[PDB]
Amino acid sequence: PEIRVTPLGAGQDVGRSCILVSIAGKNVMLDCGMHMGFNDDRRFPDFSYITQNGRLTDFLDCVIISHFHLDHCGALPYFSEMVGYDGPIYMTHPTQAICPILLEDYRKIAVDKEANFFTSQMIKDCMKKVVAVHLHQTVQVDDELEIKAYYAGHVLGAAMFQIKVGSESVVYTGDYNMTPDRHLGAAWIDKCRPNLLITESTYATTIRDSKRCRERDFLKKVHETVERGGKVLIPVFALGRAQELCILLETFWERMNLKVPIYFSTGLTEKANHYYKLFIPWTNQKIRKTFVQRNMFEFKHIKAFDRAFADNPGPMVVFATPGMLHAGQSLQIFRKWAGNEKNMVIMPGYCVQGTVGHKILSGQRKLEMEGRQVLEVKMQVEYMSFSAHADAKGIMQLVGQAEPESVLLVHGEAKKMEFLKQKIEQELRVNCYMPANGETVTLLTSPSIPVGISLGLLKREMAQGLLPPRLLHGTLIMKDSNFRLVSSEQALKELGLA
Amino acid sequence: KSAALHIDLCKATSPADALQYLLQFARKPVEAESVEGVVRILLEHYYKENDPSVRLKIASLLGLLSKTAGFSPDCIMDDAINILQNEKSHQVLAQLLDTLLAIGTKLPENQAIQMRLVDVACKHLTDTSHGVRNKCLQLLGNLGSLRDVQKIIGDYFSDQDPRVRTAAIKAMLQLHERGLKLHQTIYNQACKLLSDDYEQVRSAAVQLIWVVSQLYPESIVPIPSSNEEIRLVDDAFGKICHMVSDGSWVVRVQAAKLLGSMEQVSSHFLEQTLDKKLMSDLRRKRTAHERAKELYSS
Amino acid sequence: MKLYCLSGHPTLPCNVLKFKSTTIMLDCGLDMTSTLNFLPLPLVQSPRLSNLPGWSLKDGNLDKELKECSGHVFVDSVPEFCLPETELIDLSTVDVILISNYHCMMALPYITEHTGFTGTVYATEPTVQIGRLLMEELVNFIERVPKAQSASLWKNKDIQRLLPSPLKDAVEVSTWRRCYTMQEVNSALSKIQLVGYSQKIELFGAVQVTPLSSGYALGSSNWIIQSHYEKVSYVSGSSLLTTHPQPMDQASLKNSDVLVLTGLTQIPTANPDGMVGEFCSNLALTVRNGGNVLVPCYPSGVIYDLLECLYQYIDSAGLSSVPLYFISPVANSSLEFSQIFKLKHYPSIHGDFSNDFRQPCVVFTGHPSLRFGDVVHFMELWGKSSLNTVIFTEPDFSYLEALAPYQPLAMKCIYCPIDTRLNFIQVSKLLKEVQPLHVVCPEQYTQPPPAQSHRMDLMIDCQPPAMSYRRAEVLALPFKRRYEKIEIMPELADSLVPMEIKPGISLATVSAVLHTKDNKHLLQPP
């Protein structure tokens, strides 16, 4: 009755979220990722379990993937042919639609950078081995184990998954936002009482209101820039992140409106527009209602921007493509904005992508590119946590609703996690971990044995209960098939001994 | 027509023939003196009939006849009580208890009400019957005095079914609304069940916490509970806040109205409020501003 | 287990299951044949209605409130809808209500706002919304014209005995009520909690209910009510194959102790596909001759299946420039849902429609009943022209009732009823495999249909009990064994003391004490 959890890529390290979980006799991998900022050695978090059993299918019963981010599902196509996995890969319906979109786009950026990467061929192969699981739908993946989705917010398709085989439930909760950000209300999990709760610890410091604070900060920053041709250079790594940026720009225009200039994500913002409109069910309840009665996500400005914002020194509000990548549209945009007063750049996400993340952290003017390029920046660097995620207050709350026997911290930095772990240990009467990459926690539980009573017996004892001391006798019949509890007399009669 | 009806009831060919006739009679109204007629007849039939289905409707009919404007339910409450003692299926008994509650409210005389209450305390102890228990709680609550009643209700506060738990809370709540004064024992009991699994229970629980909070704001809770001693109302306000942040959309609605309605909260605690956690469902959001303005006056 | 049957009609059942100390109202349905019984009510005063005679019932009494059209009586009150009997079982005691299909969930707000009930209705997300816009559609139609002032005044038994055949056959007369307001609709929809498919929503820690996929139109949710020992399965609106909606979950409905089947083909000789084809032919023929086409349909289900075929025929026939004008308030909403999950829709008649009206067209109108809605008015305009046709696509209402008040009509009348719901052969094949021990289904299914002599009737090996109105029927199941889990740290050890009697049987003396927390059982040593 021991459940062994070993993060091969998650744990103390943020990104490459991969967590193997051995509830009873069943192994289940919780994600499989592409840690960014490294040319090699991090395409796929190394697979100890793979090295042991040649075929993954035999060793691994099942794989649940949280959502489309390259962090989580990025290296899901690794597994098409090379390590040769077959079985039900389980994502929510919104996830699986957008998952290939980001897979292929990264595939594109990788080949222009030779590298033995998955072609579209093998990405498609891997995608053909996928089962879509609706929200709050209990699906038995095996005879014994079953998995149920929950609403994780964060993005359309963020599924909080509870793998339960018997009475012991491990509920992973990765990238869940506990506030009603746009496109998403607050993430609800019911009172499962799972044995182990696994959480994202990206924010181990308690934050202000998710929406109001982020509006205030954005507006202030924009106004500050605007004085002398204030530029905008904002990285956006997701489809639903682009929409967020567009809404923020709309808000700016509403409050101010002094400068007409607006820019959009990229050429194919048509697509994002499309996808969001498609999945009305999953979106925030209120937002969906508003959409059924109002127009959603109008944008026709991207094309106008591109030409205007081709290395010229104006006010254009450009949210460029993949900011924290080796190359891309975003890198080009950053190079364009580099070394001018006009320029202000915002890091909307967590801005933790290996080397680029480190550069963001220390914000060194004398920054060195991977190639032999000398770029010196003299713009204003401000970071805001506008990224959809749960603050350390939020983590506390969800721990509350689940109220597990224990918690395990993955997907934050160790320092931050340490403090959070201490807090949770003090606050709720549970013992919580913060394991490193490749380190397993053998958290002992015990078996909870299900047996059937005779209804007569139960009734009688219940009656004894209410008038007040309540000792109850009787025997078990044990065929190992149908464990039953019967009365003294009844058992005697059953086995035929007078 | 009273004696014709008598004849029709027995002449039923099958159990389910009897059932329909009773049903049809339900749909024709009965005057003061014919209601006396039919009650008697319908009791007689009840004795002699072996199918529960029919017994159940007989009971429903009885209740309907009790509720008649002209009718006074005297000389047949004793009969009802007698049949209660010697009945055997929980559904029918619950229906009869419901009839008894109807009878109780029909005439406000002190003596008969008390008799009925005692009868229902007896029926309150019924076992593995979720429904007799609930009906009993309801009736106790409805026919109750102005202490013993209040003390009784806590027993069923801690009951197997959440369905009984709720009923108990509502019963106490009812006792308040007929001009009674609940005790601080009740307060502690209400604080003990604010964090039950079922959504119903939680809804009711805060309702009551608010009730007793308004009853004893001046009183204080001696227990430190990891801090220095503070006011009852202070703690009540706190507990109701927590509920705003609880994991349900309807539990929050309960909290919001009550949080706003709270008075003589200490200026410190009132200032500190996390009532600005308005989010998600926009019904709650709208609701929580309404009372904000009512009490910003204050 | 006692199941109380509270509604007569096979189509809308409202059957209340008392089981494992928890009672469930398996559906809430509004019948609507009573409404077809009353005289039709137009948006704008129609000459005929004003100039109609009485039926000369005489015998003293009423000549005001009974009329005569083509030798058939109607009543000069507002159409009144039959609703499931409320008397046999108290609503309070029926705990939660499960609601299967959006068509079958009407009359929810009657009960919730009229007769006392404090529980939580469980219905899957699509059906709630579709049903919401359908009741709003219904309320709008009856309240467009305030002619509800009048009283029926024919309900008396004596009056019924003397009056003629059409009215005579009302199974209940006294339970008829005028339609609920938009407030009650709102209350009803509010109390519904939206529960997805295959979701194990458990009530009061007693039984586990879950809405399985039925195969029928979007939101069609047959239900299984299991308790770890007895699985009771409820099988309404459960068309096998209807294309787009997720198919019927036969495997999930398998090995059910007690199967209740209620939704089934209104027409046994449906021949769905053929009728769709014929429909489109007829429409085409008439638009070609230059006469107009009228289709009385609802705002979901059948409407969209018929639209996809029409487009295809136009593509194949090149019969363009014939405006397909859909006229209904919630048309807006209807199309929106289709999107979420050359036709021009106008919420308001005498508006965009009037300005854009063209000489030939195919108009899909307000209500199939022909009593309340916009159909009435267009029916009147096109009645007097032989050219113009009316196609009844809807099975709910018999061909002949609509024809009855409007009997002197020139319009060519065509019947093209399409029901995707399981056929009797389909139900027969379903039930061999699903293999349930007792099945409960209305009398209607038990006997062959009145129309046809032939033995198409629903039969199972176990000879299934026939339901009926006001019939409380008790099936033959007593609970024999119920679950109880064993403690981990204290109990397991002491209760792991087996003493072997036989090779395959062991015996352990178990002593503990039981806490009955939230209706669950746990034995642990004191």
Residue numbers in the entry:
A (entry chain B): 2 to 114, 117 to 471, 476 to 505
B (entry chain C): 35 to 180, 194 to 345
C (entry chain A): 1 to 61, 64 to 343, 372 to 556
Quote the passages of the study that discuss this structure, keeping the authors' original sentences:
The Integrator is a specialized 3′ end-processing complex involved in cleavage and transcription termination of a subset of nascent RNA polymerase II transcripts, including small nuclear RNAs (snRNAs). INTS4, a HEAT repeat-containing protein, has been identified as such a direct interaction partner of the INTS9/11 dimer (Albrecht et al., 2018). RNAi-mediated depletion of all three proteins results in a higher degree of pre-snRNA misprocessing than for any other INTS, suggesting that they form a minimal INTS4/9/11 core complex, hereafter referred to as the Integrator cleavage module (Albrecht et al., 2018).
The C termini of INTS9507–556 and INTS11450–502 extend from the body of the complex and form a tightly intertwined composite domain, hereafter referred to as the CTD1 dimer. The structure of the CTD1 dimer resembles a β-barrel with hydrophobic residues facing its inner core. The inner, concave surface of INTS4NTD is in contact with the MBL domain of INTS9, and H1–H5 interact with the INTS9MBL domain by forming specific polar contacts. Importantly, the simultaneous interaction of INTS4NTD with INTS9MBL and INTS11MBL via its inner and outer surfaces locks the relative orientation of the two nuclease domains, which would otherwise be associated loosely. The relative orientation of the MBL and β-CASP domains of INTS11 resembles that observed for CPSF73 (Mandel et al., 2006) and its homologs Ysh1 (Hill et al., 2019) and CPSF3 (Swale et al., 2019). In this configuration, a cleft leading to the active site is too narrow to accommodate the RNA substrate, suggesting that the nuclease was captured in a closed, inactive conformation.
